[PDB]
Amino acid sequence: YQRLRHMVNDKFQVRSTGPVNSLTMQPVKGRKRHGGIRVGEMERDALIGHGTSFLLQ
């Protein structure tokens, strides 16, 4: 057996309330910087899909 060099849990992160960009006032990008997880257009579409308006809000 061979042990592969990669430590897969390198992108392991958690954010409650971290720093925000001045213009958008939205969580700033950066795992180590206590950054936010992006909820993109597809996740927006999925939250519209369930008809779950408060989850989207």
Q: Which residues bind other proteins (CB under 8 A)?
A: 6, 8-9, 11-18, 22-24, 26-29, 35-57
Nearer to other proteins, 1 or 51 (CB): 51
Nearer to other proteins, 2 or 40 (CB): 40
Nearer to other proteins, 1 or 23 (CB): 23
Residues 34/19, Cβ–Cβ less than 8 Å? yes
Nearest-angstrom CA–CA distance, 19 and 42 = 25
Q: How far is the CB of 46 from other proteins (least distance, A)?
A: 4
Residue given tokens 């939250």 in the structure block: 47
Nearest-angstrom CA–CA distance, 20 and 33 = 10
